[PDB]
Design a protein around this ligand. Structure first.
Ligand SMILES: *[C@@H]1O[C@H](CO)[C@@H](O)[C@H](O)[C@H]1NC(C)=O
Ligand SMILES: *[C@@H]1O[C@H](CO)[C@@H](O)[C@H](O)[C@H]1NC(C)=O
Ligand SMILES: *[C@@H]1O[C@H](CO)[C@@H](O)[C@H](O)[C@H]1NC(C)=O
Ligand SMILES: *[C@@H]1O[C@H](CO)[C@@H](O)[C@H](O)[C@H]1NC(C)=O
Ligand SMILES: *[C@@H]1O[C@H](CO)[C@@H](O)[C@H](O)[C@H]1NC(C)=O
Lengths: 201, 596
């Protein structure tokens, strides 16, 4: 048949403003056809790792649920967004499971997200009592109690605000420039699968 | 639960906020320096005041974490720089007076003019002025006039100011549990808490003397040869036995003897290395200069420059109205932003300066993975020595013939090496007695061994004893002659230049033994050898995370500063000078024989 009603990957990838990594957006994708080969053929993506598939298996295998998680990080912790890594974003902001079956897509966004006075709107969580579970989200702004003394909500010598701002100025070096990262999760449940690759007529 | 986890969280918070505010301050300073505008001055003042207030607040919070419960040495190294009270230990009145004193030192030193007494019609500043007449003119009387005029004016301006400065700095150091402010300057070389590698700050004044007592015969032969050669331009003014008059040394303070090379060249008929006419005939550019420097760096195995460096550096005079400070400065703004501010001409000296500043940039990029407190040289001499390695390597005929700049059939015989080593001596071993004397005088002044009424007598006595220079006319305590230099008037430590000049030859000998160069050290090029680059990068990458003794031992195998590579570098020049001074009076006694 003809191919129409594709998945809105252009809604996710080409968005005007992405979310920060402490409050990453998660979008459920279902009941549509997705062209991953179009994403691979685009040379603009500086980082494209897939951890349980190849783009050929992306085209040839149908899936039930596709979750697109989007956030902005720096270039240095792009390698942190991976299964089994240990690091500040991976511990306190966005944890991937060890048996992850999906793709991690990252590209530089210095020409959109950076501004000359500093884009302080992109936050990240610096301190947390415990590490996150895989795909956990925590938008709480609880004051981190690093010592035995109670915080009672106020700032102190051992009570710190857990969120810190990225600078994101255009004169930053590579590794400090903002990188928009989209993470796709593929999994199979006990449900009728509906998302699958395009068909050559 | 414990102290160390709280200290580590506090250090992480300080690292992130300090990187942000330090990037703001460094960007404001860059925008001031490449673009002289009063709005940029106000912006740079506001950024510096914000960073200073932030550093004072985090220094206040750092005292709550005691050091003696911390077992991790990196946490101790990051926290000791925060726990220093600095000038904040004084009262507000005394701190404000000290800051005002430092500012008026800066404004008095910056605003000196060279107008003739009874002829005030026209004159310039120091930089278009005193440098030209002191460097290029061969006349005795006008050099004496410029020397006496500048030193008398800045002495009468700066004499009581320096006395209040030394009193206030001694009070600030004694309040900060140091013995004196000279002892506070020696705190940069202090290493504690590492057994075997401990280096007391009182051992530095032993090691400097122990190295200088083996410098001294070479400097005596160099001084004897210079004094013998200077008779040709000044026949009656100087004596064959006594010391040199001060205003004949080709520099306003005698710090660098580089300008005396044209008067004291051994073989003027030999074609010396110039590579400037050949550079301009090949039609080079500043971009070509820095690209050839970057090609030299990747031959050793160092990583190349970022694209932001090429798009953000100012390598050429920007235009008509956009005035800038033309001094060569390498800039590490942090967060991967590295850039060079140095105006260029088609010159061999600008090529070597580009190598120097790119070496400083590579040293800054090397410790980028370190936390913010450890993003510094292991001591104050390392960061200046790493550029001098590149300056020594790029000046060799082997590197110039490799890049196609020098003629391929240029013959490197004996005379063309001796006259180059003499220029390197006038650059390097000439600054050693002046540097050691000046820092010894400052250490004795800050210690309190010299009263007010004996400053100039002891200074000129140690100049005659160590440097072998007599004053042209007698001077008294109404002047303050050493304070005429930039570094002493602007509260800079000056012992960095001695340690730079020994660490550069220790590093050069280590890398040339790593690069398997079988020839002499002065002809050695450390280019094209990855095995030298890895040894270099292993100490470049440490930053302040390791003691400077351990980082030194990583490359040269010795955990103390050593002087033998400097001696064996100048070994053919030393043998030629020993065979030259067969009949001249080698060395000197302290004397007033040329001028009483
Ligand atoms: C995003 O924008 C580019 C350029 O306009 C376009 O070619 C592309 O199809 C858009 N969508 C995706 C998913 O890349
Ligand atoms: C340099 O300063 C002048 C002073 O107003 C300003 O107009 C100019 O834009 C500045 N240059 C740059 C590159 O910003
Ligand atoms: C000091 O702390 C850092 C950061 O936690 C750690 O990597 C390092 O191993 C510690 N050093 C020692 C000697 O425990
Ligand atoms: C630096 O060197 C690498 C490897 O040689 C190269 O891929 C890169 O393009 C170079 N970058 C610049 C700015 O020369
Ligand atoms: C360094 O290696 C390059 C690559 O072969 C060569 O062109 C150059 O002449 C070498 N330099 C020296 C000094 O041998």
């Amino acid at each position: 048949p003809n191919i129409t009603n594709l998945c809105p990957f252009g809604e996710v990838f080409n968005a005007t403003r992405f979310a920060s990594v402490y409050a990453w957006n998660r979008k459920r994708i279902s009941n549509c056809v997705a062209d991953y080969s179009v994403l691979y053929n685009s040379a603009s993506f500086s980082t494209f790792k897939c951890y349980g598939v190849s783009p050929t298996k992306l085209n040839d295998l149908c899936f039930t649920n596709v979750y697109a998680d989007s956030f902005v990080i720096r270039g240095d912790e792009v390698r942190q967004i991976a299964p089994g890594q240990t690091g500040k974003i991976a511990d306190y902001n966005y944890k991937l499971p060890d048996d992850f079956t999906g793709c991690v897509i990252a590209w530089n966004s210095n020409n959109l997200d950076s501004k000359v006075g500093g884009n302080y709107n992109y936050l990240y969580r610096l301190f947390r009592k415990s590490n996150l579970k895989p795909f956990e989200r925590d938008i709480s702004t609880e004051i981190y109690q690093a010592g035995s003394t109670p915080c009672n909500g106020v700032e102190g010598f051992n009570c710190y605000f857990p969120l810190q701002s990225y600078g994101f100025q255009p004169t930053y070096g590579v590794g400090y420039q903002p990188y928009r990262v989209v993470v796709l999760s593929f999994e199979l449940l006990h449900a009728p699968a509906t998302v699958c690759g395009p068909k050559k007529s | 639960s414990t102290i160390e986890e709280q200290a580590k969280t506090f250090l992480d918070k300080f690292n992130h906020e300090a990187e942000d505010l330090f990037y703001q301050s460094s960007l404001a300073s860059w925008n001031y320096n490449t673009n002289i505008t009063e709005e940029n001055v106000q912006n740079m003042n506001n950024a510096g005041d914000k960073w200073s207030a932030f550093l004072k607040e985090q220094s206040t919070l750092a005292q709550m974490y005691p050091l003696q419960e911390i077992q991790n040495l990196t946490v101790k190294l990051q926290l000791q720089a925060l726990q220093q009270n600095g000038s904040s230990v004084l009262s507000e009145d005394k701190s404000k007076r000290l800051n005002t004193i430092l500012n008026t030192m800066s404004t008095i030193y910056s605003t000196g003019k060279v107008c003739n007494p009874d002829n005030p019609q026209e004159c310039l500043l120091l930089e278009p002025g005193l440098n030209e007449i002191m460097a290029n003119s061969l006349d005795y009387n006008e050099r004496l006039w410029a020397w006496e005029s500048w030193r008398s004016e800045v002495g009468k301006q700066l004499r009581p100011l320096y006395e209040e400065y030394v009193v206030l700095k001694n009070e600030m150091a004694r309040a900060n549990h140091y013995e004196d402010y000279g002892d506070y300057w020696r705190g940069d070389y202090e290493v504690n808490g590492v057994d075997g590698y401990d280096y007391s700050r009182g051992q530095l004044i032993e090691d400097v003397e122990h190295t200088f007592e083996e410098i001294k015969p070479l400097y005596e032969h160099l001084h004897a040869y210079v004094r013998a050669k200077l008779m040709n331009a000044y026949p009656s003014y100087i004596s064959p036995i006594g010391c040199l008059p001060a205003h004949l040394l080709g520099d306003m303070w005698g710090r660098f003897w580089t300008n005396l090379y044209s008067l004291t060249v051994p073989f003027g008929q030999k074609p010396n290395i110039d590579v400037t006419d050949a550079m301009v005939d090949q039609a080079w550019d500043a971009q070509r200069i820095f690209k050839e420097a970057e090609k030299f760096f990747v031959s050793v195995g160092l990583p190349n420059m970022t694209q932001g460096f090429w798009e953000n550096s100012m390598l050429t005079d920007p235009g008509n109205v956009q005035k800038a400070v033309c001094h060569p400065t390498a800039w590490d703004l942090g967060k991967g932003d590295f850039r060079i501010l140095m105006c260029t001409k088609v010159t061999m000296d600008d090529f070597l300066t580009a190598h120097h500043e790119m070496g400083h940039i590579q040293y800054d990029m090397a410790y980028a993975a370190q936390p913010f407190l450890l993003r510094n040289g292991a001591n104050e001499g390392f960061h200046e020595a790493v550029g001098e390695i590149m300056s020594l390597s790029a000046a060799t005929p082997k590197h110039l013939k490799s890049i196609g700049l020098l003629s391929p059939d240029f013959q490197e015989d004996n005379e063309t090496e001796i006259n180059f080593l003499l220029k390197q001596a006038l650059t390097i071993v000439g600054t050693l007695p002046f540097t050691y004397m000046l820092e010894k005088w400052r250490w004795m002044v800050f210690k309190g061994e010299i009263p007010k009424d004996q400053w100039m007598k002891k200074w000129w006595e140690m100049k005659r004893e160590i440097v072998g220079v007599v004053e042209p006319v007698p001077h008294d305590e109404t002047y303050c002659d050493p304070a005429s230099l930039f570094h002493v008037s602007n509260d800079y430590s000056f012992i960095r230049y001695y340690t730079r000049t020994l660490y550069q030859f220790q590093f050069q000998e280590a890398l040339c033994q790593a690069a398997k160069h079988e020839g002499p050290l002065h002809k050695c090029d450390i280019s094209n050898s990855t095995e030298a680059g890895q040894k270099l990068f292993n100490m470049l990458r440490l930053g302040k995370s390791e003691p400077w003794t351990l980082a030194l031992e990583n490359v040269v195998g010795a955990k103390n500063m050593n002087v033998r590579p400097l001696l064996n570098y100048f070994e053919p020049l030393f043998t030629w000078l020993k065979d030259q001074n067969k009949n001249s009076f080698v060395g000197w006694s302290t004397d007033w024989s040329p001028y009483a």
